[PDB]
Design goal:
- The structure is a homodimer of 490-residue chains.
- Chain A is α/β, with parallel strands linked by helices and 490 residues long.
- Chain A is built from 16 helices and 24 strands.
- In chain A, a hairpin with a 7-residue loop joins β17 and β18.
- In chain A, α15 packs parallel to α16.
- At the A-B interface, α3, α8 and β13 of A face α3, α8 and β13 of B.
- The complex binds ligand UML (2 copies), chloride ion (2 copies), potassium ion (2 copies) and magnesium ion (MG) (4 copies).
Chain lengths: 490, 490
């Protein structure tokens, strides 16, 4: 369409040049701007992209949105606005015909479990033979087609384009992980949600939020941003075992569905039986109690599957059909995955990377340790270290602990492993600057019948290194390649 | 319509009896429930209205919404739900066909100035000859028809009925004051806003919110609850002279318009000239700067009229037509009103009742005191007293200060005046247990050419007394009746 119609949506603007031109693309990355693109400049943590306006002109782009008039050829139209990214989200949703209004959208937020719940909703939808899309830490997925991305919640234009791709591919629904960063930073401006789901709130991301207070209020935006139109069928799904759910109630008018294991809720799990192969439980609901078989491991994953079932049920699918669909659901990549059970050791990978997520992981694996628990964990570079010794303490619930860096970036890897080491409660631990080296060591130390857990990365395919350069790395592959060498069964 | 269709909007319910019945009314007050009403029970601060279910049955009501099965005749249908008031707002907006979707709705929140801004928007709309409604501290107004009410933001059912009355009366827009209580307590569930306006945030209501933190987050709900549909023409209007506006930006995607006098903003007031008769100023806007004449007194009222003009402009009315409409706008009742200027004293009433609102009032009146400033203020009963000595301090900017109770309820009136007295900085003050007696005294003490200010009630027609019984009381009438006696000019 033409720039003219797009910019009628912006009341405060100084327009320098014609808006008669056709527009088919928008971008906040200058490297992809061309004729027919709007390039929207912004000030990032690293660079100020106003500086690349001359590049997009060179590349054919005839329209930039800026916060200050730039030096450009006369024939490039400039639209000067007070808040360029705000305008970016308005222009994006407009250009792509409001993609989040065009399908059912589920949003999941919380400190741990976002990937698990969001992926479980997508997998249920697929099992029911409905087209579905997923966006989050594992990247972007339409039905069974995956690509990897840089964020859990990508910047507004990329994110909006991805919702449009899901609509164009014929998705009937889409599920998004909603990071607390994404919310605060405006990454989700324009994204209408139909169901908002909460997992839990425990200390994380305080290098960004400053306080627990601010962190929780950040996550409440998913709930309050549902809005106020009570003709719409929207729903909220809350964990009654987390005390922040009481606050979440208050920020939204839509009907709330609660789930719980430890505290009373509308939906509960009773009579729980655990195995490394999955769980069974009695699913108390307001309409009756039903036996559920789930392939996922542990109680934390029972909270998670409950959230996912309730989310899908809320939009009109019978509980009986959901419960049946859950039985042979595929593993969630990198989230409590038991690797090749033909190995003579239990080899398990998981993304847990805060003290609370580690306790849930260890709680789930521990009843099944027959001999020694060998536990590897990483601490992330350039993050709040306040609870890192505490991660170290929690790791020491294991018999043998390996400390590694995880995406150390420009931080000294020794600094991070030393920080974890501060909380260790026995002498049975060891630190490696190189995580691949650390995994090969956990295999070396492991006996037949031992349990080995690799925590904090799952199948994440890179280590962020100095310069913020991504280097290939795969806990699962490194661990398997080393476990076959040591145990056979290649 | 029938209960059947209404309750399809509620997913979790236990229905005891038929829903075949016709429903034309909903109520959370048992005293108005009858045949065709839904009575929704709830637990209040005073009583639990579940107890009156037998009364509504006696009165003919055949449908109650409860949080627990009650003792009732068999032919009364009960719908048992986990959150009765949440369901009340859903049922109400449904029954009345979503009244807030049916007109343009402006919402105003902030510690001081809500009544001023909200009333100024209504008055502009009327001046432009458009049907308009107002709801807030001065009660409910359709065009020029007024009724008084008990709250600034009434409980959900009353509030929703009032929006419906405005729609039925043909209102093209409606403006609501949005109290921080109303937001937290769910009074505004279902109410779609098109424009959200912020005045300021300073200490108040902490007996309810506990912290400034929680108090500000409460008010952010108006902004975040606008939602995420960027096809809708919604706008946010923020005061750049208040540092909470920086936080408000972040909780909403809609375009933001800023106003300011002390700090840079998109809309500013320059070259300000003041009189007891009104102000003139240069109104800097993004489209040019225009001379404005306003009937309201002081700089705080210039922030207020700016917010109101920008709100009306945002929905498509030209600034030139608004600016012309503003010139002879009617006084806002109880908000910096200069009473009979034929009196030989300046007699002024105002609602200011926190330390910050008092400073703004005194700032506005002071340049015009020719002799002595005689200042009367009340402290409210059963409220946080932490800043009350500070109100006492601020009052003592006057030459002679009268301390009174304001709605003392069950609090000792001496306790409240004594608390104000704690902050007094000179010996020229006096305390009265009876506020009428106090006003008659301010007249006694006043000379020709003095300024008398009555603060904290405006034209509020009652004193809440022991038992929470309202007794008639009117600062304006009591003051005028006493000023005529003393000065003549009946
Ligand atoms: C600190 C931060 O926010 N930088 C995000 C931000 O960078 P910058 O602001 O530095 O970008 P830069 O300054 O280069 O560019 C600004 C703008 O200029 C543009 N530009 C730039 C260069 C150029 O030549 N041309 C051009 O047009 C560019 O497109 C952008 O529009 O903009 C990028 C693009 O959108 C994101 O990809 C970054 O995200 C990084 C990867 C991140 O790590 N972000 C973290 C903070 C994050 O967002 N986390 C959440 C939650 C996930 C999480 O935090 N997980 C844990 C996991 C820990 C365990 C790991 N196993 C963690 O990482 O701590 C999320 O991903 O949604
Ligand atoms: C503490 C509080 O919230 N009680 C509000 C609340 O009472 P209760 O919970 O005690 O009601 P109660 O317990 O009796 O009844 C519960 C339920 O049972 C029902 N019910 C009751 C009796 C019955 O026989 N049958 C029946 O069906 C009834 O309709 C209700 O649905 O429900 C009423 C009805 O909806 C409101 O009218 C009250 O509001 C009062 C007046 C108030 O003062 N509220 C304050 C806290 C307030 O809301 N303030 C804000 C902001 C304005 C403000 O605070 N201004 C300052 C002004 C100070 C300067 C003054 N010059 C202040 O007052 O401090 C606002 O009004 O939006
Ligand atoms: Cl509940
Ligand atoms: Cl601004
Ligand atoms: K949607
Ligand atoms: K509206
Ligand atoms: Mg997180
Ligand atoms: Mg995730
Ligand atoms: Mg207030
Ligand atoms: Mg008010």
């Amino acid at each position: 369409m033409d720039a003219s119609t797009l910019f009628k949506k912006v009341k405060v603007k100084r327009v320098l040049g014609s808006l008669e031109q056709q527009i088919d693309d928008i971008t906040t990355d200058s490297r992809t701007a061309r004729e027919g693109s709007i390039f929207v400049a912004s000030v990032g943590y690293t660079v100020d992209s106003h500086k690349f306006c001359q590049n997009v002109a060179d590349q054919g782009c005839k329209l930039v949105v800026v916060n200050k008039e730039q030096s450009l050829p006369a024939n490039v139209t400039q639209v000067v606005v007070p808040d360029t990214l705000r305008v970016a989200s308005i222009l994006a949703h407009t250009l792509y015909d409001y993609p989040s209004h065009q399908l059912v959208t589920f949003g999941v937020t919380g400190t741990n479990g976002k990937t698990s719940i969001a992926t479980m909703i997508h997998l249920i939808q697929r099992k029911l033979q409905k087209n579905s899309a997923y966006l989050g830490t594992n990247g972007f997925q339409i039905n069974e087609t995956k690509t990897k991305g840089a964020n859990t919640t990508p910047e507004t234009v990329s994110l909006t384009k991805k919702i449009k791709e899901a609509v164009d591919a014929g998705a009937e629904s889409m599920t998004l992980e909603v990071s607390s960063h994404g919310l605060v930073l405006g990454r989700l401006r324009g994204v209408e949600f139909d169901v908002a789901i909460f997992s839990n709130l425990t200390q994380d991301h305080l290098d960004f939020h400053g306080t627990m207070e601010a962190y929780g209020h950040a996550k409440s935006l998913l709930f309050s941003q549902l809005g106020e139109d009570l003709s719409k069928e929207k729903y909220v799904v809350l964990n009654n075992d987390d005390s922040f759910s009481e606050y979440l109630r208050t920020v939204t008018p839509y009907e709330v569905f609660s789930y719980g294991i430890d505290e009373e809720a509308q939906f509960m799990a009773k009579n729980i039986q655990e195995s490394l192969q999955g769980v069974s439980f009695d699913f108390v609901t307001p309409f009756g109690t039903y036996p559920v078989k789930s392939p996922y491991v542990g109680k934390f994953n029972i909270s998670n599957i409950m959230a996912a079932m309730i989310a899908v049920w809320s939009k009109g699918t019978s509980l009986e059909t959901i419960i049946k669909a859950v039985e042979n659901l595929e593993p969630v990549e990198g989230r409590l995955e038991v690797l090749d059970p033909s190995l003579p050791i239990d080899l398990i990978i998981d993304y847990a990377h805060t003290a609370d997520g580690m306790n849930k992981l260890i709680d789930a694996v521990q009843p099944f340790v027959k001999q020694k628990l060998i536990f590897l964990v990483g601490m992330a570079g350039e993050r709040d270290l306040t609870k890192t010794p505490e991660m170290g303490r929690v790791a020491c619930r294991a018999d043998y602990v390996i400390f590694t860096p995880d995406n150390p970036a420009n931080d000294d890897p020794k600094m991070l492993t030393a920080e974890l080491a501060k909380g260790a409660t026995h002498q049975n631990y060891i630190e490696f600057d190189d995580r691949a080296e650390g995994i090969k060591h956990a295999i070396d130390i492991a006996e037949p019948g031992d349990t080995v857990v690799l925590a904090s990365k799952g199948r994440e395919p890179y280590q962020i290194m100095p310069g913020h350069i991504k280097v290939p790395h795969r806990d699962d592959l490194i661990g398997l390649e080393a476990a076959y060498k040591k145990f056979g069964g290649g």
